[PDB]
Structure formats: C-alpha cells, structure tokens
C-alpha cells in the first residue's frame, strides 16, 4: 500500500487553472506542508502532474 | 469505385432495400439449371433450406410447376419452423415468369408476401 | 408574398367545392391556364383540384 508523503513548494501563484484543483484535491491547504496517501494511480496521477509542484516521498 | 460499383449487373442493394425490414430475405437465388433460395433474416440470421431443385431431386417439369412447388413446399417447410410473414427476395433478374413461379410457391405456400 | 410579375406568381386551387383551398407557388414560364391536381377539402376527402385563381 505504497503510502505517499508530499510537501509544498513553489507557490501555484497564478499557475495553471486545474493544476490548482489538483492542489485543493489531493488535499492542499496552506504552504510548505506535508500530506500522505496510497499509491493509487488516481491520487497518484494528479500529484505527479503537479510534479514540480513540490516533493513526493514513499512512506506510510 | 467500391467493389460493387465497378463490376456490374447485380443490385444487391435492391436487396438491402427489403433488408430494412418486413420479414426474411426470402431471397431466391437462380441459375436456370435450377432455382435455389434461402431465408436471410436481419440479425446475422441464417436459413433453413426451405426449397431447392435438388433437395428433392430436380424432377422433370421444367420452370413452371418446378417453382410452383419448390416454393409452396419451401413455404411448407418453414411455416413448420415458426416464421409466418416473410419478405420476398427477387435475388436477381426481374420477377421473370421462373421467379414469379417460385413466388407463387411462397404465396400459395401460405407464407404471406 | 413578394408580388413579382416575374414568372413568379402565387396561386391556389378549389376542391370541386370540397370547399376551400391549399398553398402553392407558380410560374407561367410554361403551361399557362394549366393547373390541376386532387386533394381533399374539409369536404370528405380527395376531390379534383383546379388551381387557377
């Protein structure tokens, strides 16, 4: 159940529409914060696309 | 042209005309030497050798009768299956006097048309 | 309509009396006093139908 642990970086300030949603989606409130999830290609996708967005970590 | 637009003679599409609906492609394939028809009905349907000149030998009554019967019977064979109202199939040439013949078959055959 | 004495002339046609009429556009172009066809006035149904008007 590869549990994913991402953080916040490079404010999406003014950056692509959607991209943001992928923000509020994955669950992204305040800045430079850390959240985690299951691999799930879903959640996965989003995040990834967000790529440069911040940082992903394989945790649990 | 597309396969059916460079050769010539057929009209298959004047078959698809009845295809739309009405009942079985009471299609009647001819070849003088004799007459042979099936029953292509919609849905990758099939047939039931309803009437053929050989099925019951080819007799010795030429055109006339042949048909007269081949049909009738045919019509007989089918209405045993569970059809009822079947659409005609000029298969080819113009409802020639043959044709017309067979035709009779069906009709007389009680298989409405 | 746009009444244009140009081979373009609008006309109708009675129903032997079937009573009234029914719409139609025309053109002297050919066959002048020519104009017949059947329909069905409130009068039963069908009925010969001259067109002239």
């Amino acid at each position: 159940m590869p549990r994913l642990k991402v953080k916040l970086v490079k404010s999406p300030i003014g950056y692509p529409k959607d991209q943001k949603a992928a923000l509020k989606a994955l669950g992204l409130r305040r800045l430079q914060q850390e959240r985690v999830l299951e691999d799930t290609p879903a959640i996965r996708g989003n995040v990834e696309k967000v790529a440069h967005l911040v940082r992903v970590e394989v945790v649990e | 042209p597309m396969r059916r637009r460079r050769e010539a003679r057929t009209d298959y599409h004047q078959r698809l005309r009845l295809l739309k609906s009405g009942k079985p492609r009471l299609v009647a394939r001819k070849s003088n030497k004799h007459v042979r028809a099936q029953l292509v009905t919609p849905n990758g349907d099939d047939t039931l050798a309803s009437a053929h000149s050989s099925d019951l030998a080819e007799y010795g009554w030429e055109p006339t009768g042949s048909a007269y019967l081949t049909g009738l019977l045919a019509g007989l064979r089918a209405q045993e299956a569970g059809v009822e109202e079947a659409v005609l199939d000029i298969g080819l040439n113009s409802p020639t006097p043959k044709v017309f013949a067979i035709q009779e078959g069906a009709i007389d055959a009680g298989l409405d048309i | 309509a746009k009444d244009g004495p140009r081979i373009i002339v609008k006309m109708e046609s009675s129903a032997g009396t079937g009573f009234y009429y029914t719409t139609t556009k025309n053109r002297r172009n050919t066959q002048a006093k020519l104009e017949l066809k059947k329909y069905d006035p409130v009068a039963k149904k069908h009925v010969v139908f001259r067109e002239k008007k």
């Binding site: - | 295809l19 739309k20 919609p42 849905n43 | -």
Partner: protein, 86 residues
C-alpha cells in the same frame, strides 16, 4: 445608389455541425449524429464511413439520425446489452 468592386472583402457567416451524443452514451430517441440535417436517421449505431470500420454507441431506443453521407447512416443495429429483459 449601388455597390462597388475591387474590395473582395466578404466575411462569412455561421454554421453548427457536431456528433452530439458521441459514441457510447445514454441513448435517447433524439438527434443522433449530425453533419447533414434534413438527415434521414437509422437504426441504432453507425459504422459505415469514408474511413473503413464502424462505430458503436452502446445506446439503444427507437432510432437516431444521419447526416447525408459523412458519418455513415445507421442500420447495423446494436440495442446494447442494456435492452434485455428488465
């Protein structure tokens, strides 16, 4: 009191062609595929086209409608498994 020349300048107006309902959705006895009105609908989906194969619309009811040549008038039925006994 007339109009001029050597000014080609001649904007064009509007249309509104589509595939409405695209391929394989909730089928409703209504405007099937469109790109030629006066159209003459057909039965179920359509697969005939200046392309080769065919197209299914896992959606079945009364009928749909054509577009005059394009797409490819319907006829290759295809009610859909969602048309059996309740």
């Amino acid at each position: 009191a007339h109009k001029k020349g050597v000014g080609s300048s001649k904007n064009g107006r509007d249309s509104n062609p589509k595939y409405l309902g695209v391929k394989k959705f909730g089928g409703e006895v209504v405007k099937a595929g469109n790109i030629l009105v006066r159209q003459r609908g057909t039965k179920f989906k359509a697969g005939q086209g200046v392309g080769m194969g065919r197209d299914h619309t896992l959606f079945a009811l009364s009928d749909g409608k054509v577009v005059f040549i394009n797409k490819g008038k319907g006829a290759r039925f295809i009610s859909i498994e969602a048309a059996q006994t309740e």
